[PDB]
Design a protein around this ligand. Structure first.
Ligand SMILES: Cn1c(=O)c(C#N)c(N2CCN(C(=O)c3cccs3)CC2)c2ccccc21
Lengths: 117, 117, 114
């Protein structure tokens, strides 16, 4: 899985341990091995939410499976909780786009995850 | 809705009020209320279009509904027009990826927009 | 087509000629003219892969068609090869998301490709 956070929160406000916490909590939430979890945090962005430049975040979570109605609501509670606690971003100024990726459409290690045919 | 612009145009060339203008124009175009519109502009990028590093942009528009053949043509004219007028980027050096998002696949405010089941 | 690379490799470690090589090799692999190919490289990123901040890359390739099982494996071999050679990123620390775009969902020059 891959999780990307774009935010107008300054780099200096991103706490020590943030990437690691995301990595571990996402491994637990998705049930995927932490060795396969990638995280990407992009601070100091020029963005607006509702026209306001108060702290906000635009996020993506990509996973092969483990994406769905109830699961995505669970991820949102987890991830919004972390963004609020660590970056002080209000949950109602966060968007997270969820993508259920087909194994054939994810490249890794010179190939993809479609090794069957 | 969420609109992202990545461009090699300098930060200084992004006019103040550009995010506000995008927010207002997108609310009008999509029929969505401005409170739910997010905008993100990323200048000074290392990019090429057709092998050339003249001004260009790679963009995305994510929306729950309001994405489609004729609507996307209308969005393209609107958005290219703004990028041309405001950032001086030629419309034939702009790509915009459109995404019709399912409500269940967009997280916000500790949950998603699938509140029904 | 368009290809984006986000990496924690420093900007100074991106070699002269990299964008051009990506453009031409992607033109070759996708069967589309190089004047159609867009490339975007984002160095100095704050990222981790498997909990480690050794060099890694998160990428995307969008194309109207030319996306599929065997084709994507070929793109991956090509792109991981370039990232390893040019940016010294290990292939098992690269992800590439492939998107088969509908022509109606790609805007360009005031319209779409539908
Ligand atoms: C005249 N013309 C085309 O007919 C097509 C055609 N066909 C072009 N593209 C190649 C296929 N495309 C893609 O695969 C994508 C580009 C960005 C996301 S998907 C869109 C641009 C194209 C691109 C740039 C300029 C003219 C172009």
């Amino acid at each position: 899985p891959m999780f990307i956070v774009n935010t107008n929160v300054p780099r200096a406000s991103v706490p020590d341990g943030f990437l690691s916490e995301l990595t571990q909590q996402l491994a637990q939430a998705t049930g995927k091995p932490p060795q396969y979890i990638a995280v990407h945090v992009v601070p100091d962005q020029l963005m607006a939410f509702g026209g306001s430049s108060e702290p906000c975040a635009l996020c993506s979570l990509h996973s092969i499976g483990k994406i769905g109605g109830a699961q995505n609501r669970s991820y949102s509670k987890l991830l919004c909780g972390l963004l609020a606690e660590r970056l002080r971003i209000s949950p109602d100024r966060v968007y997270i786009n969820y993508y259920d990726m087909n194994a054939a459409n994810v490249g890794w290690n010179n190939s993809t995850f479609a090794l069957e045919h």
